[PDB]
Amino acid sequence: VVMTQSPSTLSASVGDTITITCRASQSIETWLAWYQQKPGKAPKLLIYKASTLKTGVPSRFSGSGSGTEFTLTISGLQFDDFATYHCQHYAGYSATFGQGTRVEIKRTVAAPSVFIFPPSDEQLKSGTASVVCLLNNFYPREAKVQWKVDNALQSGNSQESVTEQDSKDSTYSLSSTLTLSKADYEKHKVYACEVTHQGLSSPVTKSFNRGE
Amino acid sequence: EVQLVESGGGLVKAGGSLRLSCGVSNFRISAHTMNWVRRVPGGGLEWVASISTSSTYRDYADAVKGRFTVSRDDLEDFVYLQMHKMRVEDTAIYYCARKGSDRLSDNDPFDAWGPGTVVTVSPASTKGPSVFPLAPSGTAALGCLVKDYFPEPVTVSWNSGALTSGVHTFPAVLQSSGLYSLSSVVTVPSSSLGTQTYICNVNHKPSNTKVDKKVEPK
Ligand SMILES: OC[C@H]1O[C@H](O[C@H]2[C@@H](O)[C@H](O)[C@@H](CO)O[C@@H]2O)[C@@H](O)[C@@H](O)[C@@H]1O
Pairing of strands B78-83, A190-196: unpaired
Q: Tabulate helix, strand, coil % of chain A (nearest 5).
A: 5, 55, 40
What is the 8-class DSSP label of residue B192?
G
Query: CB atoms < 10 A from the CB of B14, how many?
Result: 16
- Do A114 and A192 fall within a single domain? yes
What is the distance between the alpha carbons of residues B5 and B19, in angstroms, rounded to a whole number? 14
Exposed (0-12), middle (13-18) or buried (19+): which is B138, by Cβ within 10 Å? exposed
User: How far is Cα A102 from Cα B209, in angstroms, rounded to an integer?
Assistant: 36
Strand partners, B93: B39, B118
Please give, rounded to a whole number of angstroms, the shortest distance from the CA of B176 to a CA of chain A.
11
Q: Which CATH number goes with the domain that contains A122?
A: 2.60.40.10
Same domain, A67 and A126: no
* HEC letters along A34-97: EEEECCCCCCEEEEECCCEECCCCCCCEEEEEECCEEEEEEECCCHHHCCEEEEEEEECCEEEE
Domains and CATH numbers, chain B: 1-123 (2.60.40.10), 124-218 (2.60.40.10)
Strand, coil or helix: A9: strand
A97 alpha carbon – ligand 1 mean position (Å): 21
> Do residues B200 and B145 touch, judged by C-beta distance below 8 A?
no
User: In this structure, which amino acid lies at residue B207?
Assistant: S
Q: What is the CA radius of gyration of chain B?
A: 23
Resolved by: X-ray
Instruction: Round to the nearest angstrom and report the end-to-end CA distance of chain A.
Output: 58
What is the C-alpha to C-alpha distance for residues A98 and A88, in angstroms, rounded to an integer?
A: 6
End residue of a domain, out of A53, A84, A106:
A106
Distance CA B96, CA B8 (A): 12
**Three-class SS of residue B216?**
coil
Distance (Å, whole) CA A35 – CA A88: 8
Clarify whether residues A136 and A59 are in a common domain.
Answer: no
Residue at a domain's end among A47, A78, A106: A106
One domain, residues A6 and A19: yes
Write the DSSP string, A151-170. Answer: TEEP-SSEEEEEPPPPTTT-
Identify which of B97, B109, B132 has the shortest CB distance to residue A120. B132
Best CA proximity match to B65, nearest among B46, B52, B83: B83
User: Among A202, A101, A97, A195, which Cα is nearest to A148's?
Assistant: A195
Task: State the resolution, in angstroms.
Answer: 1.9
Check: CB of residue B164 under 8 Å from CB of residue A139. no
Q: Which of B45, B59, B143 sits opposite A93 (nearest CB)?
A: B59
Q: How many Cα atoms occupy the beta-carbon half-sphere of A2 within 13 Å? A: 2
Same-domain status, A128 and A55: no
d(CA B146, CA B141): 17
CA of A139 to the centre of ligand 1 (A): 47
Tell me: cis bond preceding A7? Omega within 30 of 0 counts.
Answer: yes
Contact A185, A193 (CB under 8 A): no
**Domain count for chain A:** 2
Residue A138 and residue A93 share a domain: no
User: Residue B204, Cβ neighbours under 10 Å: how many?
Assistant: 23
A70 and A5 in a single domain? The answer is yes
Report the residue of B103, B170, B182 to disrupt the A interface, i.e. the one with the largest count of A CBs within 10 Å. Answer: B170
User: The domain containing residue A168 runs over which residues?
Assistant: 107-210
Count of C-beta atoms within a 10 Å radius of residue A145 = 19
C-alpha separations of A10 from A13, A191, B203 in Å:
10, 35, 36
Query: First and final CA of chain B: distance in angstroms?
Result: 58
Give the up-direction half-sphere exposure of residue A64: CA atoms within 13 A in the CB hemisphere: 7
B105 touches ligand 1 (CB under 6 Å): yes
Domain limit, last residue, from A88, A106, A124: A106
